[PDB]
Amino acid sequence: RGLNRVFLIGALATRPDMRYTPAGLAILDLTLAGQDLLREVSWYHRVRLLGRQAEMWGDLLDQGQLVFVEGRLEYRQSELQIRADFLDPLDDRGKERAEDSRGQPRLRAALNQVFLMGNLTRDPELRYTPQGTAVARLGLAVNERERTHFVEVQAWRDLAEWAAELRKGDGLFVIGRLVNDSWTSSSGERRFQTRVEALRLERPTR
């Protein structure tokens, strides 16, 4: 059964970029930044709002603003983007921001949670770090009522060892955090990709 829900709370790293297609569809791209201590983790996630939910916040959001986004992952051949269905500005009373080397704000103790359910597209791939830590990498296919969204899921330690027994075709329920990799290809090609780091895994037997 398909499940694909994203919940994010962070600060706007920069003032959002609003544009319109020739047909009048509003597109609002935002960059949410947050960090937490699980191991200190930080993230910058690009989110896209469309239509009326986008126009609603046009010229109202500035860098630093804390926002809550409810959305979902959307796959395209590849690229996995974060689609915001709704955005809600939040009061920053009692909240603290960190500042990166570029002067951009990141919300401390931010929210980065995703719920996913689908089936494995292949058998799990497990490797061990020099220190002996287990790391599992899974390929997940999430159906939505019809298209399929492919998501790379990574798990650590016990969670990784639990996942190693899974096999292609198995159902998989995941609660995780969105993460991304960024680098420069052989040439100048600036690369970027989004994936999920599992916090909880279950095997639905529907």
Residue with tokens 């603290």: 96
Residue 77 makes CB contacts below 8 A (sequence gap 6+) with none
Give the 3-state secondary structure of the chain: CCEEEEEEEEEECCCCEEEECCCCCEEEEEEEEEEEECCEEEEEEEEEEEHHHHHCCCCCCCCCCEEEEEEEEEEECCEEEEEEEEEEEECCCCCCEEECCCCCEEEECCEEEEEEEEEECCCCEEEECCCCCEEEEEEEEEEECCEEEEEEEEEEHHHHHHHCCCCCCCEEEEEEEEEEEEEECCCCCEEEEEEEEEEEEECCCC
Whole-angstrom Cα distance, residue 112 to residue 180? 12
Amino acid (1-letter code) at residue 203: R
Amino acid (1-letter code) at residue 191: R
Question: What are the C-alpha distances in Å from 190 to residues 16, 42, 181, 184, 185?
Answer: 21, 20, 11, 4, 6
At 62, give phi and psi (nearest 5°). -125, 165
Whole-angstrom Cα distance, residue 64 to residue 90? 11
Q: In terms of Cα–Cα distance, which of 15, 104, 11, 14 is closest to 59?
A: 15
Sketch out the chain's domains with CATH numbers.
1-109 (2.40.50.140), 110-206 (2.40.50.140)
Whole-angstrom Cα distance, residue 130 to residue 133? 7
Question: What are the C-alpha distances in Å from 32 to residues 40, 95, 144?
Answer: 17, 15, 25
Task: Print burial letters for 156-177: b (CB count within 10 Å at least 16), e (below 16).
Answer: beebbebbeebeeebbbebbbb
Annotated resolution, angstroms:
2.0
Whole-angstrom Cα distance, residue 190 to residue 182? 8
Question: What are the C-alpha distances in Å from 49 to residues 72, 86, 102, 191?
Answer: 11, 7, 25, 22
Whole-angstrom Cα distance, residue 105 to residue 96? 10
Q: In terms of Cα–Cα distance, which of 133, 116, 117, 135 is closest to 125?
A: 135
Backbone breaks in the chain after residues (C–N over 2.5 Å): 38, 77, 145
Q: In terms of Cα–Cα distance, which of 72, 14, 74, 68 is closest to 44?
A: 14
